[PDB]
């Protein structure tokens, strides 16, 4: 037939992120001498909204140790921290809401956010609105620690990664149902152009494998193997099962 | 026009058969409320300034 | 357009110059002539 | 234009060599009023006089080295 | 009445091109474009407008006299309430450091 809408998506023509009003990549303060050998405390001068994500962003002030003057950074805000609160990063810092600590210090059963799956990437995991993670227990010899991610998997990360004590704010955003189409349109304004969905089965029989016929039915098994080519992966991709879940 | 407006001031064409705007269209109930509230509140201000009435009764009214 | 570039104005002058008819006394010894409305210069 | 009231200021600005021309108006108010105007590279300074006597004395007190103009 | 027309070559009513009509000694209604309004200087702490200083545009602020740009008390780009707060905070936290140091021994 022709190229499918599931194929044109990755070409980069109109699916580029609307980066015009984004206030800054969410990144945590990176390594230095002080972080690895003690506490360093800054303050949060302001907290703002980011049009793309849900969780707000904290504009954090810091002072360097080699050049006179300040630096600014944007952190993924966690719940219940206020403007003016002093935020401490490093190893020897006291564990409290909003602070930054290496994974080899806090006890088990403490909620956490902004993990770092490989040390130095300055913040990579658990950043969505209203989400958290929990450490299950450190290694007996150190150097390792397992954490239970929100999806429900136990991942092992070194002890020299960093994380934030507390929970990412803006929790339960999914509770309120969208009523009007306008809310959905406004929401998808500032992320992508993946909306509206448009059912595949009502497509013309040439721009989607699902379409065609006189009763708008799929006509062949919807599940498709993981080894399929680019234009074939369109259904329930290599489904392990179907139907309602049973725990 | 001037003769008709003089008759208008004398009140000769207020007929319902002549009105063609709604009750709220011909005069704003909101604006009439503003006028009423403003005149009575100014009266209360003059009352307190002359000290004819005490503050405790003033606030109640 | 009330706003024009220098080369465009000069080219319009050139075209108006071209629009001039053949002198009389030369004929004693044209066909490429446009009209302001019939043919558009396009430039 | 910049109206000036104090009279010693005007007598000072008259002596300034950068000034060229003076302007004398006469007009009927209700008698005659005058507005002594003075032209200089920066501005044009005017003065109102309800006193014909003061106008008469000041117009001749002004130095002769500058040119005089009357619009009417 | 009369009828008017734009004159400053930009015939749209964008918020940099608003109009205040006036009449002339010639007896005609002309058009003038009033300069766009500008914001006000604000304290760095409370983000609140501070007094003592004019609120012109860039060029007008440059042209303004030095007597219309600052309040003469230490900071001057900080509201008086905030500067007082900073001053006594500055003294007292230093003294707390001193007393903690002396009680350290």
């Amino acid at each position: 037939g022709r190229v499918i809408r599931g194929q044109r998506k990755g070409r980069g023509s109109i699916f580029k992120s609307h980066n015009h009003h984004r206030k800054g990549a969410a990144k945590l303060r990176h390594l230095d001498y002080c972080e690895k050998k003690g506490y360093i405390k800054g303050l949060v001068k302001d907290i703002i909204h980011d049009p793309g994500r849900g969780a707000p962003l904290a504009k954090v002030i810091f002072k360097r140790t080699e050049k006179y003057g300040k630096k600014e950074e944007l952190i993924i805000a966690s719940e219940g921290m206020f403007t003016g609160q002093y935020i401490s990063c490093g190893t020897k810092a006291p564990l409290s809401v909003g602070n930054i600590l290496p994974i080899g210090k806090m006890p088990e059963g403490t909620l956490i956010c902004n993990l770092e799956h490989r040390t130095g990437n300055r913040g990579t995991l658990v950043k969505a609105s209203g989400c958290y993670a929990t450490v299950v227990g450190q290694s007996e010899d150190g150097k390792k620690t397992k954490v239970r991610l929100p999806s429900g998997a136990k991942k092992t990360i070194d002890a020299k990664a960093r994380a934030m004590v507390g929970v990412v704010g803006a929790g339960g955003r999914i509770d309120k149902p969208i009523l009007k189409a306008g809310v959905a349109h406004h929401k998808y304004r500032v992320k992508r152009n993946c909306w509206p969905k448009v059912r595949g089965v009502a497509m013309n029989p040439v721009e989607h494998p699902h379409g065609g016929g006189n009763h708008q039915h799929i006509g062949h098994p919807s599940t498709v193997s993981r080894s399929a080519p680019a234009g074939q992966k369109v259904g329930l991709i290599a489904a392990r099962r179907t139907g309602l879940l049973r725990g | 026009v001037r003769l008709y407006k003089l008759a208008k001031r004398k009140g000769r064409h207020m007929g319902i058969g002549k009105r063609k705007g709604t009750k709220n269209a011909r005069t704003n109930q909101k604006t009439l409320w503003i006028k009423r509230q403003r005149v009575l509140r100014r009266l209360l201000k003059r009352l307190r300034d002359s000290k004819k009435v005490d503050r405790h009764l003033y606030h109640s009214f | 357009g009330s706003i024009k570039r220098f080369r465009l104005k000069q080219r319009l002058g050139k075209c108006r110059r071209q629009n001039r008819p053949v002198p009389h006394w030369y004929r004693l010894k044209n066909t490429k002539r446009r009209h302001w409305r019939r043919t558009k210069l396009g430039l | 234009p910049k109206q000036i009231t104090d009279i010693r200021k005007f007598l000072k600005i008259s002596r300034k060599p950068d000034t060229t021309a003076v302007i004398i108006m006469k007009k009927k108010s209700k008698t005659v009023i005058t507005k002594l105007k003075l032209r200089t590279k920066k501005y044009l300074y005017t003065m109102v006089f309800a006193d014909r006597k003061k106008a008469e004395r000041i117009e001749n007190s002004l130095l002769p080295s500058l040119k005089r103009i009357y619009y009417p | 009445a009369q009828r008017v027309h734009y004159r400053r070559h930009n015939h749209y009513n964008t918020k940099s091109n608003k109009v205040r009509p006036v009449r002339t000694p010639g007896g005609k209604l002309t058009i003038h474009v009033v300069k766009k309004k500008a914001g006000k200087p604000k304290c760095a702490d409370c983000k609140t407008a501070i007094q003592g200083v004019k609120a012109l545009r860039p060029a007008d602020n440059y042209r303004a006299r030095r007597k219309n740009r600052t309040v003469a008390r230490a900071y001057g780009s900080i509201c008086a309430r905030c500067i007082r707060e900073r001053i006594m905070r500055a003294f007292l936290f230093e003294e707390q450091k001193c007393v903690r140091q002396v009680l350290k021994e």
């Binding site: 909204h49 707000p56 206020f82 003016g84 564990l95 059963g109 929970v167 704010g169 803006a170 | - | - | - | -």
Partner: protein
């Protein structure tokens, strides 16, 4: 008087949308729009400003929080943190 029996704040939506989705939504905006107490001043004057930021009118000191609840069970882990 009491203009409506039970619809309340969701009467703005008119007759559209089902009751199982209007009674459901009404559970949350009632305690969203209502102002909340501020710890820093004790004045119940904290409103919402965006999806996750609350502001006290008196303090002019804003605090992050949940989508619509200033505090939530997922955010009452501060007790576990603070027992140390």
């Amino acid at each position: 008087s009491r203009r409506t029996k039970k619809v309340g704040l969701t009467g703005k939506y008119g007759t559209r949308y089902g009751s199982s989705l209007r009674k459901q939504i009404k559970k949350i905006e009632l305690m969203q729009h209502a102002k909340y107490l501020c710890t820093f001043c004790g004045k119940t004057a904290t409103k919402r400003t965006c999806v996750g930021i609350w502001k006290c009118k008196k303090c002019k000191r804003k605090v992050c929080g949940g989508a619509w609840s200033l505090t939530t069970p997922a955010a009452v882990a501060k007790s576990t943190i603070i027992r140390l």
